Amino acid sequence: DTNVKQVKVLQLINAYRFRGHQHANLDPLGLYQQDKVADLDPSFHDLTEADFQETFNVGSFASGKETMKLGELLEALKQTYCGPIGAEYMHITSTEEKRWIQQRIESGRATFNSEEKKRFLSELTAAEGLERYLGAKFPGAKRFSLEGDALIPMLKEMIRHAGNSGTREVVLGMAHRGRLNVLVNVLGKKPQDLFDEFAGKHKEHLGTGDVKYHMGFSSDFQTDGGLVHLALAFNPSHLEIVSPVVIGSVRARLDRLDEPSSNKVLPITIHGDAAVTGQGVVQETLNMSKARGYEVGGTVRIVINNQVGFTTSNPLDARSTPYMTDIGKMVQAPIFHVNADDPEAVAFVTRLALDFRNTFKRDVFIDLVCYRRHGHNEADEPSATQKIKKHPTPRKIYADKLEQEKVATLEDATEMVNLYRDALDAGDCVVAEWRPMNMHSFTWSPYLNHEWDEEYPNKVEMKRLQELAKRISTVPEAVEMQSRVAKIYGDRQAMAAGEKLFDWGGAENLAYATLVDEGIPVRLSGEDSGRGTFFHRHAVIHNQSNGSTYTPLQHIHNGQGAFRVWDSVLSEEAVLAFEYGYATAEPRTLTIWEAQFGDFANGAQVVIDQFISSGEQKWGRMCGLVMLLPHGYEGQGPEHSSARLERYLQLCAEQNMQVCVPSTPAQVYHMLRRQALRGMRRPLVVMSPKSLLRHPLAVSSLEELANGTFLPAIGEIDELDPKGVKRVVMCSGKVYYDLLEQRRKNNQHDVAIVRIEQLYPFPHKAMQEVLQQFAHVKDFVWCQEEPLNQGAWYCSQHHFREVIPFGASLRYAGRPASASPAVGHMSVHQKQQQDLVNDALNVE
Amino acid sequence: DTNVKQVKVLQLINAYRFRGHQHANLDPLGLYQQDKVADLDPSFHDLTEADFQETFNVGSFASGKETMKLGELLEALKQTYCGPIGAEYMHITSTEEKRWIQQRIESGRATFNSEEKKRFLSELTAAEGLERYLGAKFPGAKRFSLEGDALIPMLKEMIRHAGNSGTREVVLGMAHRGRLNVLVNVLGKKPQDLFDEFAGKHKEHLGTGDVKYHMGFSSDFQTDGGLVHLALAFNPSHLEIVSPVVIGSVRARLDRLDEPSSNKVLPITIHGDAAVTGQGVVQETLNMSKARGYEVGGTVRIVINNQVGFTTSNPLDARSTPYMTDIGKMVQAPIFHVNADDPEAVAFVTRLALDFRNTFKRDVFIDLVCYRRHGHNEADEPSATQKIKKHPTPRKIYADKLEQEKVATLEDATEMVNLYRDALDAGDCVVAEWRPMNMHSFTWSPYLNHEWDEEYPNKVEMKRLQELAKRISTVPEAVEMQSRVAKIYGDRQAMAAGEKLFDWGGAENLAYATLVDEGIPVRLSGEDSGRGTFFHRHAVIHNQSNGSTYTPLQHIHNGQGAFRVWDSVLSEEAVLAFEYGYATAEPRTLTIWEAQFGDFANGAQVVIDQFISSGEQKWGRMCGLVMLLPHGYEGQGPEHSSARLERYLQLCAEQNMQVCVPSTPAQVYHMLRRQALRGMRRPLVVMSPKSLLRHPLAVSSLEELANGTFLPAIGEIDELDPKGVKRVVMCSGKVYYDLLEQRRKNNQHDVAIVRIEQLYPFPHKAMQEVLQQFAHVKDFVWCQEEPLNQGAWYCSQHHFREVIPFGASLRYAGRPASASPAVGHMSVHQKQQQDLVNDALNVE
Numbered sequence A, B: 001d002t003n004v005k006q007v008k009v010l011q012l013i014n015a016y017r018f019r020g021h022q023h024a025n026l027d028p029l030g031l032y033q034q035d036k037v038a039d040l041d042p043s044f045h046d047l048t049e050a051d052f053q054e055t056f057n058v059g060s061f062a063s064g065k066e067t068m069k070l071g072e073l074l075e076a077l078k079q080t081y082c083g084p085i086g087a088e089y090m091h092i093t094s095t096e097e098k099r100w101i102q103q104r105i106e107s108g109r110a111t112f113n114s115e116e117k118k119r120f121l122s123e124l125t126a127a128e129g130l131e132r133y134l135g136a137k138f139p140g141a142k143r144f145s146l147e148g149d150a151l152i153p154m155l156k157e158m159i160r161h162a163g164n165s166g167t168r169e170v171v172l173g174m175a176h177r178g179r180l181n182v183l184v185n186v187l188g189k190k191p192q193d194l195f196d197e198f199a200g201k202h203k204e205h206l207g208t209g210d211v212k213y214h215m216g217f218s219s220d221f222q223t224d225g226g227l228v229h230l231a232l233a234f235n236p237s238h239l240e241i242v243s244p245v246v247i248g249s250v251r252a253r254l255d256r257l258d259e260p261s262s263n264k265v266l267p268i269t270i271h272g273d274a275a276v277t278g279q280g281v282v283q284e285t286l287n288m289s290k291a292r293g294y295e296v297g298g299t300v301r302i303v304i305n306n307q308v309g310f311t312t313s314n315p316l317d318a319r320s321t322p323y324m325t326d327i328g329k330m331v332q333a334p335i336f337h338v339n340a341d342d343p344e345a346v347a348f349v350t351r352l353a354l355d356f357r358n359t360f361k362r363d364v365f366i367d368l369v370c371y372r373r374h375g376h377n378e379a380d381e382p383s384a385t386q387k388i389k390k391h392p393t394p395r396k397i398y399a400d401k402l403e404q405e406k407v408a409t410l411e412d413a414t415e416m417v418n419l420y421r422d423a424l425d426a427g428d429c430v431v432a433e434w435r436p437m438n439m440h441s442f443t444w445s446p447y448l449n450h451e452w453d454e455e456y457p458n459k460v461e462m463k464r465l466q467e468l469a470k471r472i473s474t475v476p477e478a479v480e481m482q483s484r485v486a487k488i489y490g491d492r493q494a495m496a497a498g499e500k501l502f503d504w505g506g507a508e509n510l511a512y513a514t515l516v517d518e519g520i521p522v523r524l525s526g527e528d529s530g531r532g533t534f535f536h537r538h539a540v541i542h543n544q545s546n547g548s549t550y551t552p553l554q555h556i557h558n559g560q561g562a563f564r565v566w567d568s569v570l571s572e573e574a575v576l577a578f579e580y581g582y583a584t585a586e587p588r589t590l591t592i593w594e595a596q597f598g599d600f601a602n603g604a605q606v607v608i609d610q611f612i613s614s615g616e617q618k619w620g621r622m623c624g625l626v627m628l629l630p631h632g633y634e635g636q637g638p639e640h641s642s643a644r645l646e647r648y649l650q651l652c653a654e655q656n657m658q659v660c661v662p663s664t665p666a667q668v669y670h671m672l673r674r675q676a677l678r679g680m681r682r683p684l685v686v687m688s689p690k691s692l693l694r695h696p697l698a699v700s701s702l703e704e705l706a707n708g709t710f711l712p713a714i715g716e717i718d719e720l721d722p723k724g725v726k727r728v729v730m731c732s733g734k735v736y737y738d739l740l741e742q743r744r745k746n747n748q749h750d751v752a753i754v755r756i757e758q759l760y761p762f763p764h765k766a767m768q769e770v771l772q773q774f775a776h777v778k779d780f781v782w783c784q785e786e787p788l789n790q791g792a793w794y795c796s797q798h799h800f801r802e803v804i805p806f807g808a809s810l811r812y813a814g815r816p817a818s819a820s821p822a823v824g825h826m827s828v829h830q831k832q833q834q835d836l837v838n839d840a841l842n843v844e
């Protein structure tokens, strides 16, 4: 009769552990408050009340406590769950996690000593002093004021606590706002250079530069556990694309270690206000946060919940979700709502989150709710109600709290402000732990300032090459194959014996085997490329008799290159930024990316347009990814057909990318080793075709791989007398073979065909060396199988009209331009295909 | 002593309501089973056991039940929560929803009568008979076999139950697989035409066509509640981009109703296997599923959990999330796991989901777990373990169940198969409820087959125009303005009196007012465009004294056009597909889309490349969106600067889009009414600039709007003698005014400037009519402020070299090509800016 209220308050306290966080006080100004705060939440609503003076504890379990009253229970517990911080954790089903968080945030509050309180007030006082000093000198600029002020102490506290738990390199990517404050007061960028580039006239690099709030920065940081090599990743004007970049960066920093002890490398990510729930890249990347080959045990990603949206106020249902970070209930990841009014709470919360990520290896969020004092660039209008003016600064209330706590007086905080302004006026480095950088962490020292025509050790010893073929083809008899897989491997065993010529797939993973034994690893991580998309790689043989897998490239010899294929989850726009961040933080590993189809790789456009094709000219950051893109006009579809090639050729600028179209498999051999061990890291977008995978003219002998060389522009392979030749046909892609299968079909001698295997670095030497044998002929053509807008026809005026001789002319052959690059119907497709091929060969 | 076990089993049954679904049996073949199924889940694990023969019921609450045993309790309850279906619902915090689902799925199981059982077995028997017939006639094709077979009966059951609850038009977008089965057996496409286009040689439209599994289809369906106008939206080869398209389509079908009673229009969406958790568009669109101006009360979106990922098997932690649809815990939306082994369960579940969406107005998911019998196109290899061969077909087990239920024998089901094969052999329409279509639902009847030079009633009565200005400018004195807002509105009141010329923003919402009174509504729904992105629209005046809003375009007169501005959530790639689906399902409303910046609109590339610029040529589907894109080289940033213009001009094909760059605000007036009330609906991508918003040469008199006309190519506005003129400068964008502010600065008479306000439909008449006054001059130039790759310089060979006279020449002026279109540093930016302008004016 009296224990029914005991179990009833156990029920209500469990349901108050579920949804106690919406009764909590989170807004630093007090406009996040809803009216639905007393509805089955407290004791007083349903069946219980006060004025009892008795409530016993957990009972027979010896807690050692003096729990006397349910009013005392809720008053002690609202000071834990419902106070400055809310804890959205009870929905995780893993009971070890639940009891671990119960052991942390209920039984014991981590009370801080006096010196840590002093350093928190000092550091956030320094943060707000920095931004007011920036307003003092430079009045009007793209400043992106932080003004929430809780970010700096919790960043430095989490860096200190990661130092005490041994995390040697922790990299953070973040959005545009709060940039300069973390660059100065956390990492320790040189403030005088920052004020110089505010004042402009800066000579940082020979590239085209970028605005001052995009350049991230590496630094060395001293904690009580040792040195910490912490970096800040780059960022374009787009938001929220940087978290797959930074998870790529930490997987690159984990593979350069001997062992992926995932506590030793930490990604942080600071997200925007309405972009952790706005942008769809975070769905893919925290989805990707537990997939094998992609996970780093999660990340401590932090949401600055500004309670703004660059125009939005806070009504009831104009808010798209109830909290602005509910995404972290996709995976059963804990969320922690923390205000800015008391950074004791944010220290406690980021200690809890870092302890969580280092113990149970899953991503944690930090809901950092705070306000926005000034604007982006102009007035704080479209958020109407401004309580912000009569709301005090965080250093004022926190210093007044610690003055009431008998720690720091007005003289102390005033001396801190004046010290900090003097430190900024000096131009000295602000952070007291910044160090100079040694050369070994500067791993990109042999990979700077090259041109595409360098010499790389292309020639391979033929005996070792045949041994690589016979090791990647001979498969142990435990892992039972599939019949078509067995036919492919028997055929490439015949290719190893010199019987059959190389088709595409055998030559391509032979190129993999040529890389991985010398010591240069390869990470291919495409979508669904463990077997290839067109059934033409099969680098993972599934044992269809047992179920386990065997990779015949991970068993060549010990001391090899670390080759790991990862079939991606279906991201296509945040797997590519992952392979960017893996590619720009390790120059050794040849990181290639294979889409499922051509224009199915159109999702990552921001990653192509603003990272990989603008990285060198904006930041001076190098990247050597390879984009294996399918590209074909067989007629299988309108957008199963082709990636947009001008979307990799309207980036036509100063040897930045390099698009190249391998026709022969000898070309894909030389292109992957041209990218791998050259010395320059600039992006490939290779047009890895479809019809040439199963084609009986894949002309690739093993003679063409040992003594074969790098070829950008393969001229005529047949025998033709150039005196009678009245036409040459410059054409790239499969259409050559189509033209070839019409030229030798109708034995036409007065026209030669020249392929152009590489397009973007304007092949001058390679084209003029293969046209001195066909120079006297005037009228050239540029065939293609793409439409007239598509292809490389708007690269013609750049260099096709200088490859041409003087007394000579050019004209066009190709499909006439249509919006769909391929028509959907097969009959009209082959009709205009055959008409175009028999139009390209005209003068007979 | 005996009630402690009562409250303990209440605790364990609540915790079994939370996580009872992972103990449930869901896989139709039995390879989704985990070992962590007995861990605090049942009674037997923690503190309770069997062999009691006593357990009382809820107690004093009169349930009217005979609940005798906790073993009986769990055996009755596992037959509800843990049986053929799992119910992931308890995590929603709204207690009305919880008690509603508790009232549905536990206190009563909806047992079906005999005839509904017969029609379910008949319809799925027809589905599997269809796909085996397709395999029988046509052996090798892009078939995308359904073979899970539960989708057809639950679709038709939900259509019937929506008919009984009055839903007049329900549109579904879906992925590639399961396409043809729903086209035949649900909507009722003509099967003979489907077999004809399998056989090919089809003449469906004059456009370029698309593959047979992309063309969606409209149909009229008969239920017991009335006619239902159900459509199937189009889809490119990309996946998962179609759900914002279909939510755009239902918001268009709700605004054509008088009132948005959201039960009467239903979106369904069928998602892919690894793409409801893979692709990031669903994050944005179910985020967007409760925002005002975007919500339709949610949607019943359905996940075909194939348990494949086009290569992936099912290991433990290779699965990125525990369930393949955990996304619907972003919003607190219920999820329902349903197998395929008994479509009684899927009927019960889709009735529950449709009752949920029609009652409480929030999105529901359907986790439809089922297997994949055959492949996409080739062998079922990279999923190794194939239990599928010894697993029976669904019609076999379901017919054998109902034979055991004394309903349908072997003769009955065999007669159903033979009837269905005869119906397919006839070429008759399969569905017995398909109807012909009337003309009024064919709303696009006056909007077909036009060209861009039609006449639209451009001339406006000047008195009514000035009245529109004085109504959009005069604001009632309750809604107190902001000071800069008050200065903008006072300035445009001066513009109304003919005192000040029109700048951009006053002329642009004057164009809005010109549209909305005549009867043609405008939906501008950009990101953060309720006030404009560059503070230059202010179409929502926030009362900064009270907090509520006032829109001076929603208060012109009664009987107006419905004008509704919606500030988007930060989507940029699924707000645009929403405005596509709103634009392609209502031709009346001028639906424009304003990005925050130029290349911040690069996220939606798939929506631009495969819907709006390929819609007319692939499907023959028309769309008239407008893309308000900022575009400027002030030097504010490298990618705050410009949208890629060739990314709207490498779509150069057959009058599909129309890019146009308004210089004067008179041009933006004529362009928005050129798109609005012309009669053709083809997409604009307008380059709405930045520096011209605050520019003292915004030459737009009210003379230029009443008697002003449509101008594609404005020639020289100043007075120049063409006999001495030795240069003309064709240039578009702000650079004209830059050139103008250098031409009249240095009083240079021998060079005229000609703008080209519209680029993509090759302006033949407009350019040759403005060059007959400057024809004798030979050397023309094409200035621009964009780099040499960027701009419209790879539209030059298309028509700039035919606008040119015969005895004449062209050369280039512009920025030399760089990867970043704008350099990041302001000093070198103005340096090359001034050098380029003084290079464009050379011959003096």
Ligand SMILES: Nc1ncnc2c1ncn2[C@@H]1O[C@H](COP(=O)(O)O)[C@@H](O)[C@H]1O
Binding pocket: A218, A231, A441, A442, A443, A444, A584, A585, A620, A621, A622, A623
């Ligand atoms: N792709 C790259 N090209 C040139 N330098 C780089 C690249 N990535 C990193 N660095 C340099 O590497 C140093 C930092 O080391 P880490 O943090 O290991 O990349 C800095 O000097 C960076 O500029």
Ligand SMILES: Nc1ncnc2c1ncn2[C@@H]1O[C@H](COP(=O)(O)O)[C@@H](O)[C@H]1O
Binding pocket: B218, B231, B441, B442, B443, B444, B584, B585, B620, B621, B622, B623
């Ligand atoms: N943008 C469009 N252009 C031409 N016809 C359309 C368009 N959108 C829908 N239709 C036609 O409208 C009919 C279906 O009506 P509704 O479902 O209301 O669009 C079909 O004949 C469609 O082809």
Ligand SMILES: O=C([O-])CC(=O)C(=O)O
Binding pocket: A237, A239, A272, A273, A274, A275, A308, A309, A310, A311, B528, B570, B596, B600
């Ligand atoms: O300006 C941007 O791109 C980001 C933005 O809209 C926001 O975070 O509110």
Ligand SMILES: O=C([O-])CC(=O)C(=O)O
Binding pocket: A528, A570, A596, A600, B237, B239, B272, B273, B274, B275, B308, B309, B310, B311
């Ligand atoms: O082939 C596609 O584009 C879709 C895909 O990978 C899947 O649904 O597994």
